[PDB]
Amino acid sequence: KVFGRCELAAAMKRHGLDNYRGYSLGNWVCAAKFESNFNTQATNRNTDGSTDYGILQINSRWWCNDGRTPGSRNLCNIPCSALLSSDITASVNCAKKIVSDGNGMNAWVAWRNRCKGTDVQAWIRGCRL
Template sequence: MKTFYELLIVLSITSSLVDSKMYLSCELAKEFAKNDMERHLIPHWICLVQAESQGNTSKMVEMPNLTANYGIFQINSKDWCGKDKKGGNCNIKCSDLLNDDIKDDIKCAKEVFNRNGLNGWKGVCLIEAESGGDSSKVTEFPNLSTSYGIFQINSKEWCRKGRRGGECGARCEDFLTEDIKLDIKCAKVIYDRHGFKHWKGWLNRCKQRPLPDVSKCSYSTYS
């Protein structure tokens, strides 16, 4: 017979499995199109997410400077979201970037992009290199910050642990579910502020290199 604590562990694991998701390229293309990403930039966004979080919406990476990156865009808690409450330039809780709804991730990522371009990200070809499409990816850094979800949104600037905050006004943990709408929302914020240059993953794996081929993703897949 399972003990109470064993049941809690099972329930916790089950909840995590339900809320996080690994996004594939065509799935990302569809979500990005739904959330008004400019179509000619969608391959760049997919590359960015692959580099930052490998598509893992639950990815969280702690940074040496005590901030963290959250979700598929790895939005940082320093400027973009709040760890325990809504905050940051995106006015979201960092944890909100960790669920499977990536609308807010996209919005915040756009904000980051607009300020910093693709240089605002620190991954490896954006979603593939960052999270491999895994919406539950969490990466902790020595500076105590963490990157979350498929975009590996960092808690230093973009979200806050346990509460909404940061530049995306998001709770970092919310970037870890399979709904990546919040991730997309925050990624939009990042993009709007910094462009793709915010993500080092894009710089290292995507800039002036072949981008993911989404030509096989039919128009209906986008819409």
């Protein structure tokens, strides 16, 4: 499915992402906009054999198992296919592990390039959560 901005903000807040590991809710909403365009089914292949999956474009080299990526670590202990569900639970649970790895939200390339340093509160503005 394709989330609306405030719809995703609400869902992400219900799933405990607001201020998680020091990152306010707008960071997560912005990340999702630029990672997947709010589409839970977005996938993108990479040069190293990996693929990024779902609303938060979680990578199969480190985080989820897709059975076709070399050097896979499956640190979220989740099949990548589960991260393409319209329900964001598996993606959020994995994201929480990723952001806890010791480099914050920098693992999200689109967040790093297009969200970090901007006023991310704007992403939840008007949502009255």
